[PDB]
Amino acid sequence: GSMEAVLNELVSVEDLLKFEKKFQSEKAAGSVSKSTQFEYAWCLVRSKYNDDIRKGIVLLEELLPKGSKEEQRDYVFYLAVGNYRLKEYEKALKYVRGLLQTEPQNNQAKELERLIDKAMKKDGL
Amino acid sequence: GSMEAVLNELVSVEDLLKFEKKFQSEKAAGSVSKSTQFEYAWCLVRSKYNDDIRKGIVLLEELLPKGSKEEQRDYVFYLAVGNYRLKEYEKALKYVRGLLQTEPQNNQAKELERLIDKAMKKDGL
Ligand code: NA
To answer: Whereabouts are the TPR repeats (chains A, B)?
Structure first.
């Protein structure tokens, strides 16, 4: 599908609250999983609200050294998304260019790079 | 990420209205694209509302003979999602098993098949 649609997607209230409650439950139990932390962070970085996106970025950065290679690909993609949403354009490009270093022919990553750069330059940065 | 999360995702009000307005604009112009029709159908089949999901399924079935191979993969996946959401379990399984015929090692499709079958049997069907 469309990278622009995925990059600009806003999570629903219902899904954000569903995975927030799931994360809170595991944290209460003292047994947080990479899977649930990622599901919650995936919702947070797609929120309309700055404080949510910032929290989602922290949760993804926590996951990064714990992920297998196939997991880290997902974390880095949504770290690019989340930083883009905060106008952390430099960091967003750093994350996507890391992905491209490992996957130079990944044109989905290339399109994400274009969409971040377009926004950054539109903002005068 | 998680197939269960993707299968049960509810689209946000903002995205559904964004792509609905985009589709309406192209229809008004007389120039509907596969891309925009798919974006709108992708939101519709993730709606909470039956009439939306049904309309999204029609729009995807319209796209099926117009899609390249890589496009049809996306259409069939979200035809499985949409039919699952309507408790059209037979049709949902038909769509995912079509995907598996062409991609037998696609374990994401396999997990989608399990999640549809689990729901179908839980419903006594
Ligand atoms: Na919403």
So the answer is: 73-106
**Rounded CA separation A36/A47 (Å):** 17
Q: Which of residues 6-45 of B touch A (CB under 8 A)?
A: 9-15, 19, 35, 38-39, 42
Method: X-ray
Preceding-residue numbers of gaps in chain B (C–N over 2.5 Å): none
State this model's resolution in angstroms: 1.7
Contact residues on chain A for B111, CB-CB shorter than 8 A: none
Nearest CA to B88 out of B52, B56, B46, B116 is that of B116
CA distance A54 to B54: 37
Contacts of A42 (CB under 8 A, 6+ apart): A11, A19, A56, A78, B1, B5
Contact A40, A22 (CB under 8 A): yes
Domain of residue A11, residue span: 1-125
- State in Å: Cα A46 to ligand 1 middle: 12
Q: Two tokens at A121?
A: 């330059």
Q: Tell me how far apart the alpha carbons of residues B86 and B99 are, in angstroms, rounded to a whole number.
A: 20
Q: Is A121 helix (H, G, I), strand (E, B) or coil?
A: helix
> For testing the chain B interface, which of A7, A15, A33, A39 should be mutated: the one with the most B CBs within 10 Å?
A15
| Structural domains of chain A, count | 1
Backbone angles phi, psi at A69, to 5 degrees: -50, -45
